[PDB]
mmCIF file with all atom_site columns, C-alpha atoms in Angstrom:
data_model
loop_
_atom_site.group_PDB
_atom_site.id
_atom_site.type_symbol
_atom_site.label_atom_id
_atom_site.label_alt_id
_atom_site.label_comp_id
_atom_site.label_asym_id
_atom_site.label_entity_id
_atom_site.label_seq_id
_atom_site.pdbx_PDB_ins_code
_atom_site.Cartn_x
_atom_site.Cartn_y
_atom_site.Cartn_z
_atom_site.occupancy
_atom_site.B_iso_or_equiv
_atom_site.pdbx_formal_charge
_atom_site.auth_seq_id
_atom_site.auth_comp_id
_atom_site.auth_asym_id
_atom_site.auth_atom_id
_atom_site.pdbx_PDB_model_num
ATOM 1   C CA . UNK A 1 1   ? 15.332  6.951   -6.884  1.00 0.00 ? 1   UNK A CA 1
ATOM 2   C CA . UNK A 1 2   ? 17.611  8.237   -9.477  1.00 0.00 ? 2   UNK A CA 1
ATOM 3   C CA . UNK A 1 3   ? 16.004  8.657   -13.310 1.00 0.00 ? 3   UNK A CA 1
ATOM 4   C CA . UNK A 1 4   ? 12.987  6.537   -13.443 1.00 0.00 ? 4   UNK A CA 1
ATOM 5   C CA . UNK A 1 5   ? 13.712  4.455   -16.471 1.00 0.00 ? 5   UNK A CA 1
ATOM 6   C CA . UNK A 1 6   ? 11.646  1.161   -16.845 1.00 0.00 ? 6   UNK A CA 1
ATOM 7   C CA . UNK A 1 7   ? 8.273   0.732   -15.683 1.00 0.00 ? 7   UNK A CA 1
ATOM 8   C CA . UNK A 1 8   ? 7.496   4.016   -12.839 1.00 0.00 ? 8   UNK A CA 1
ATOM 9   C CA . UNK A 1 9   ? 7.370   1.607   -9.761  1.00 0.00 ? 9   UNK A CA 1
ATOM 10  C CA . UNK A 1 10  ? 6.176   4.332   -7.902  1.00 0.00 ? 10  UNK A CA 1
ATOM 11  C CA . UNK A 1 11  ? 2.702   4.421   -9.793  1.00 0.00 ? 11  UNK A CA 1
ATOM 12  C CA . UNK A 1 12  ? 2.476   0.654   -9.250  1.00 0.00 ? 12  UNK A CA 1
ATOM 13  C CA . UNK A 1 13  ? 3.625   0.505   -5.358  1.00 0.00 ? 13  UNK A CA 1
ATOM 14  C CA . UNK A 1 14  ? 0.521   0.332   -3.059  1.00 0.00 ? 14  UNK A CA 1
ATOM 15  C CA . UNK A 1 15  ? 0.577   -0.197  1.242   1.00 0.00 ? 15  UNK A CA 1
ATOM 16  C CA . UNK A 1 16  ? -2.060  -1.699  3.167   1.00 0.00 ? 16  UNK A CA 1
ATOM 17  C CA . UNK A 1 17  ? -2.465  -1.372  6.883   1.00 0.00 ? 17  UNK A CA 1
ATOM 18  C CA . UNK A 1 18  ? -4.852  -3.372  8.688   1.00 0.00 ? 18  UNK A CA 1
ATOM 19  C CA . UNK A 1 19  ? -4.278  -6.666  7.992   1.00 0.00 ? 19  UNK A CA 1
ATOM 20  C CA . UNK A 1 20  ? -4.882  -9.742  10.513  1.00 0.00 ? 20  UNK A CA 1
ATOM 21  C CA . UNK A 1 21  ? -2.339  -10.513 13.238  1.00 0.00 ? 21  UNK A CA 1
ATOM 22  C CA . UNK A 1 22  ? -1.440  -13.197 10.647  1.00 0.00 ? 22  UNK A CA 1
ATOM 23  C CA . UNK A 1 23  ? -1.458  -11.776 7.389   1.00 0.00 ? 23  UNK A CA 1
ATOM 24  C CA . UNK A 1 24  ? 0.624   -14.333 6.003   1.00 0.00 ? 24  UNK A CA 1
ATOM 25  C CA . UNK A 1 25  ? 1.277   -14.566 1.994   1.00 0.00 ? 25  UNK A CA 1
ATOM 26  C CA . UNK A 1 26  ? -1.678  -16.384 1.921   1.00 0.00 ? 26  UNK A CA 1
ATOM 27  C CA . UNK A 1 27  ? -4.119  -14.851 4.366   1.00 0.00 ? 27  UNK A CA 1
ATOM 28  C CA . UNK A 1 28  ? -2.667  -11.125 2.295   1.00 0.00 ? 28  UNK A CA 1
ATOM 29  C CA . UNK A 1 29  ? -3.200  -12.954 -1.093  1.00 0.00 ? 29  UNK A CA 1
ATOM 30  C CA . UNK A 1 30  ? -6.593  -14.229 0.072   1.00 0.00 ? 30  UNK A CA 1
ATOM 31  C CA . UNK A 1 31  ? -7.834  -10.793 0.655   1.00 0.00 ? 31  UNK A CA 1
ATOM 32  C CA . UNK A 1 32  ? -5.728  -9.129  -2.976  1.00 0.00 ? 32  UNK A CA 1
ATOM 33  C CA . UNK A 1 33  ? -7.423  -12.662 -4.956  1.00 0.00 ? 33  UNK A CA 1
ATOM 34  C CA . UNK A 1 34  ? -10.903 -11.573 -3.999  1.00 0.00 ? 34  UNK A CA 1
ATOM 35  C CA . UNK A 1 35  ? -10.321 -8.109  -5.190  1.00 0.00 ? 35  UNK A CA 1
ATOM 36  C CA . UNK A 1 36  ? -7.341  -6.584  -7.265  1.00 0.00 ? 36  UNK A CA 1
ATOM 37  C CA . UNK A 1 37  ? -4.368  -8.591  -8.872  1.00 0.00 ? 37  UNK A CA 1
ATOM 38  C CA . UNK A 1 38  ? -1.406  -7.937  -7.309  1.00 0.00 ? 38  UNK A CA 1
ATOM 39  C CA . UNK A 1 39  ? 2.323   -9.260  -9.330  1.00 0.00 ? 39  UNK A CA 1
ATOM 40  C CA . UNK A 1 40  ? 4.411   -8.145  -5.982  1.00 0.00 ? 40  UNK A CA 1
ATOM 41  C CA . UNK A 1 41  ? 3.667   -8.188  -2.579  1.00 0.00 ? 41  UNK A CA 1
ATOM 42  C CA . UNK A 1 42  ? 6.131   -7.370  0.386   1.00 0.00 ? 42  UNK A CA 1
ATOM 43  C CA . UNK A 1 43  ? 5.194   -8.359  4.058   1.00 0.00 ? 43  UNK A CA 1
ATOM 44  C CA . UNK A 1 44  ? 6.335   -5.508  6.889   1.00 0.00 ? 44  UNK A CA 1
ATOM 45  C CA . UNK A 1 45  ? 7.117   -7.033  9.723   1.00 0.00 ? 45  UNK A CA 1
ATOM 46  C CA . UNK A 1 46  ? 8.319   -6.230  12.888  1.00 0.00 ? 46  UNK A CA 1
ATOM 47  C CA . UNK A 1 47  ? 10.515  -7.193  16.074  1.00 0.00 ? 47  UNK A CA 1
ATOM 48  C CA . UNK A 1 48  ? 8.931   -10.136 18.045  1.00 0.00 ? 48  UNK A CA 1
ATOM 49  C CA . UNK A 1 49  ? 8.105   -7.872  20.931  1.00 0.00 ? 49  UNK A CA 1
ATOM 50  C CA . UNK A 1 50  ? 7.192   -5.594  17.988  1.00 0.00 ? 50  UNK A CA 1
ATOM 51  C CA . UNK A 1 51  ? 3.101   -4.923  16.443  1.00 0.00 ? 51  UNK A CA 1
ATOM 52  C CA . UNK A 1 52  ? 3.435   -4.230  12.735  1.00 0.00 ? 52  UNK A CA 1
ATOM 53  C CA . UNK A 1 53  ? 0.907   -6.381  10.213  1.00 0.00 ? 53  UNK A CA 1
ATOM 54  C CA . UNK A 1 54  ? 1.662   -4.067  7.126   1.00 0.00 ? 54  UNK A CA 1
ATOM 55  C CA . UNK A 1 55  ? 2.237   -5.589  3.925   1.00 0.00 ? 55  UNK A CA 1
ATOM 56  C CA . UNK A 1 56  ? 3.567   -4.262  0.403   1.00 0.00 ? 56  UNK A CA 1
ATOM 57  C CA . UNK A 1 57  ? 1.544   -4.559  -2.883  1.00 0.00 ? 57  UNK A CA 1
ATOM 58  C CA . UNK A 1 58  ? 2.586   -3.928  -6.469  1.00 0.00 ? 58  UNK A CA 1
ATOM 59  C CA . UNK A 1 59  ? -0.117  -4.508  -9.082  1.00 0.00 ? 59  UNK A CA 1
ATOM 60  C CA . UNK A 1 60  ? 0.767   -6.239  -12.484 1.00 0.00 ? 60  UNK A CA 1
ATOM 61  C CA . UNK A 1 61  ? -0.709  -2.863  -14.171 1.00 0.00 ? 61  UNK A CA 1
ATOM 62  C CA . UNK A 1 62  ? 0.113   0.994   -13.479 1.00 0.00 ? 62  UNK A CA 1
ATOM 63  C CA . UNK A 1 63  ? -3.568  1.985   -13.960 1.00 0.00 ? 63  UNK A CA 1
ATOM 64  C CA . UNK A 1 64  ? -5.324  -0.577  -11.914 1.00 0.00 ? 64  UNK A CA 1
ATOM 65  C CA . UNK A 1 65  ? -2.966  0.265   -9.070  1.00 0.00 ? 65  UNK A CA 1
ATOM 66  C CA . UNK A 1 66  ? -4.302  4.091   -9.430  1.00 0.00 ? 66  UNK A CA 1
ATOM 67  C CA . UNK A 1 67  ? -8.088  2.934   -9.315  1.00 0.00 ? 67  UNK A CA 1
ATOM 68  C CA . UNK A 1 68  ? -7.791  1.068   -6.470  1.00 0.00 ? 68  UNK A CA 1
ATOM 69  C CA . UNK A 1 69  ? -6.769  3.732   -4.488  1.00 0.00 ? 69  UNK A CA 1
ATOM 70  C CA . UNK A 1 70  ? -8.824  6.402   -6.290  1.00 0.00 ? 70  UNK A CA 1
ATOM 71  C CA . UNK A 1 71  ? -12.052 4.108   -5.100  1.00 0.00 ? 71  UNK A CA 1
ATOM 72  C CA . UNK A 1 72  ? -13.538 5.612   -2.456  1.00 0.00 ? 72  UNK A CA 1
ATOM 73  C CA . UNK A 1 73  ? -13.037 4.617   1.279   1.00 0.00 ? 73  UNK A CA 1
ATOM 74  C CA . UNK A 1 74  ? -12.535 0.730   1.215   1.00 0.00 ? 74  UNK A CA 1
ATOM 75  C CA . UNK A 1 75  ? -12.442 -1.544  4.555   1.00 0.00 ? 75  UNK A CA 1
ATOM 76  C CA . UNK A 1 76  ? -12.767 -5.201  5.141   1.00 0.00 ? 76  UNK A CA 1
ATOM 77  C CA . UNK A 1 77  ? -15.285 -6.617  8.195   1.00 0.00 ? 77  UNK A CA 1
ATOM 78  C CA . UNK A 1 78  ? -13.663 -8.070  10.604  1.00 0.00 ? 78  UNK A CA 1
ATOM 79  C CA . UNK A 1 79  ? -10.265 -7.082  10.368  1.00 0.00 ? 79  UNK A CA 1
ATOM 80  C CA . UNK A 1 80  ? -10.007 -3.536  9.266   1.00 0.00 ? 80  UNK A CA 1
ATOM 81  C CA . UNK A 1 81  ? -8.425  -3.327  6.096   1.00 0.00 ? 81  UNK A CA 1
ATOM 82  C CA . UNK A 1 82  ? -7.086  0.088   5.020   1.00 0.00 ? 82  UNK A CA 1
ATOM 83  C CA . UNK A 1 83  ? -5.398  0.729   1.671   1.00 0.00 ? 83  UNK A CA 1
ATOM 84  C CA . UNK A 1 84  ? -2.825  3.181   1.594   1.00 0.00 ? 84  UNK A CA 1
ATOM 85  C CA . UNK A 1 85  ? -1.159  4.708   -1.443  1.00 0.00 ? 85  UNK A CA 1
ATOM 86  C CA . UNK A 1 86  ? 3.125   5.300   -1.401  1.00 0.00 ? 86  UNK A CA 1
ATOM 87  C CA . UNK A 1 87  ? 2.788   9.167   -2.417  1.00 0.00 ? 87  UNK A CA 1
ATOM 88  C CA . UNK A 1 88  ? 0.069   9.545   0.733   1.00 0.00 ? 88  UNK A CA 1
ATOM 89  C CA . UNK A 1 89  ? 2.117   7.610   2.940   1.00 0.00 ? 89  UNK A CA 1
ATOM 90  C CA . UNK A 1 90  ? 5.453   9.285   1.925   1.00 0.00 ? 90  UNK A CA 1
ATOM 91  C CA . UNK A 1 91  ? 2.882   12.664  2.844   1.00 0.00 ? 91  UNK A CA 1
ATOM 92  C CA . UNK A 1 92  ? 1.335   11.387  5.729   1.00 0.00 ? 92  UNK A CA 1
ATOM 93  C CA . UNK A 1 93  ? 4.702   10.277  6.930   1.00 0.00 ? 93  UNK A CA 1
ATOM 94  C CA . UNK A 1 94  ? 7.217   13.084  6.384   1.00 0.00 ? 94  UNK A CA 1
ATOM 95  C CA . UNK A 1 95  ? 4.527   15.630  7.427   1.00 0.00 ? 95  UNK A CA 1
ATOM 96  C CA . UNK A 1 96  ? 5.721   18.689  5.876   1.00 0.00 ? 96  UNK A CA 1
ATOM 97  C CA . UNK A 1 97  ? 4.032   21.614  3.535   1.00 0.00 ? 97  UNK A CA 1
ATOM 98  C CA . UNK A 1 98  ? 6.051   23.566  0.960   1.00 0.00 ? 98  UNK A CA 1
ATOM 99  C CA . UNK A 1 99  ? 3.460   25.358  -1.157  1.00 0.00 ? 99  UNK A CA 1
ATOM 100 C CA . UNK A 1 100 ? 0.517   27.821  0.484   1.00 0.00 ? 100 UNK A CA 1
ATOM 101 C CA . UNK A 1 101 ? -2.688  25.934  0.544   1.00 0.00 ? 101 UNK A CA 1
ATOM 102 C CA . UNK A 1 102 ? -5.915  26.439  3.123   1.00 0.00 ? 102 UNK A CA 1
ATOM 103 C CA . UNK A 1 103 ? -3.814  26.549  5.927   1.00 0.00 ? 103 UNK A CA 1
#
């Protein structure tokens, strides 16, 4: 994370929680093929005795990475699919507030 030369990677990184018990690279690309072209997709796993399913997903263009997640609440039947931006995550995962706000 030191000067952001290149392409910002952080505009074009996207998470997804929600997934299958299997989202393999195909059952993940199934889902991304059907809606939203993704160039780069990394699979979270965890330790066998572990319950992850999250996967990674980097779209080919900075903007369409940006409407997907500006699109209003999007979930999948069956399995829930949930997409997840990196700067919410990052938020939702540090937890912490620097500037006032409502609360």
């Amino acid at each position: 994370g030191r000067w952001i030369l290149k392409n910002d990677v952080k505009n074009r990184s996207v998470y997804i929680k929600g997934f299958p018990t299997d989202a393999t690279l195909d059952d993940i690309k199934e889902w991304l093929e059907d809606k939203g072209q993704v160039l780069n997709i990394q699979m979270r796993r965890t330790l066998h005795k572990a319950f992850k399913g999250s996967i990674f997903v980097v779209f080919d263009s900075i903007e369409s990475a940006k409407k997907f997640v500006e699109t209003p609440g999007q979930k999948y039947k069956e399995t829930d699919l949930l997409i997840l931006f990196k700067d919410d995550y990052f938020a939702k995962k540090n937890e912490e507030r620097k500037q006032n706000k409502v609360e």
